């Protein structure tokens, strides 16, 4: 089998991407944030504290004839950005772009933190990291991809995120029309449960390429590109007027400035992030100070190849017995 779904930016900045997901019988369609940095499929629901729901579409398990309570099961998650949620668990039928899993753990939120409530466009998350990070207790549950894997034509999914535009998640096949050149595959460590890999280096604009190993994760659920402070300093030094602002919480720059591209290494291959991808607009409405899309990972404890980087590439998440990542230009 295969599946293919369009993923759509939630706003004009590509702060995140939502993908429609069918849950239950009859189908309840929710717009979920596909997140290769986590491993829980959780949704706003009829069980979510009323005051914490503000415009989201909810899953109502009582209206699904295929929903079954996973008795005794609870979940609770906290994300790198400080947000969180928790609740109980049902199993139900879940379909993504024509690909159907029966008996998928659907984690129903009883509580969500403010940032989720405040974002009316995201109805939940669909985790695509490794199932070892799944938070369901006492019995850990598998991700949608893990459950679908054996049935797929090939045990892979691909992320093709758009710049200020929709893109595509495919399951079970590689669309050879979606990228230019060849796909370069690179080793993955699953030891922290992430799609973790090592970039071979970087370049700033037309500058010479610096060969240096950068360990990080391919994370569709993170907006920006978070890299070591040295790398990030080298980038923003090439932007007139840029500075790191402790009050704002990272690098900012005047919108009158021209942003250089940023290139990262995949083996001997090279992915170029155009400068425009690194602009995240005014820090506040009307401000001439713009927020940068490349920021320091210092104090996160891991480097994160988030949407800023991934949307410059066609990315293969290869779930073969030994997982790998593939990157192509497009």
Swiss-Prot record:
GO terms for molecular function: aspartic-type endopeptidase activity. It catalyses: Hydrolysis of proteins with specificity similar to that of pepsin A, prefers hydrophobic residues at P1 and P1', but does not cleave 14-Ala-|-Leu-15 in the B chain of insulin or Z-Glu-Tyr. Clots milk. The keyword Transferase does not apply. Its EC number is 3.4.23.22. Keywords: Aspartyl protease, Disulfide bond, Hydrolase, Protease, Signal, Zymogen. The active site is at residues 35, 199. One of its GO terms (biological process) is proteolysis. Disulfide bonds join 255-290. Residues 17-328 form the Peptidase A1 domain. Belongs to the peptidase A1 family. This is Endothiapepsin. It comes from Cryphonectria parasitica (Chestnut blight fungus). The chain holds residues 90 to 419 of 419 of the full protein.
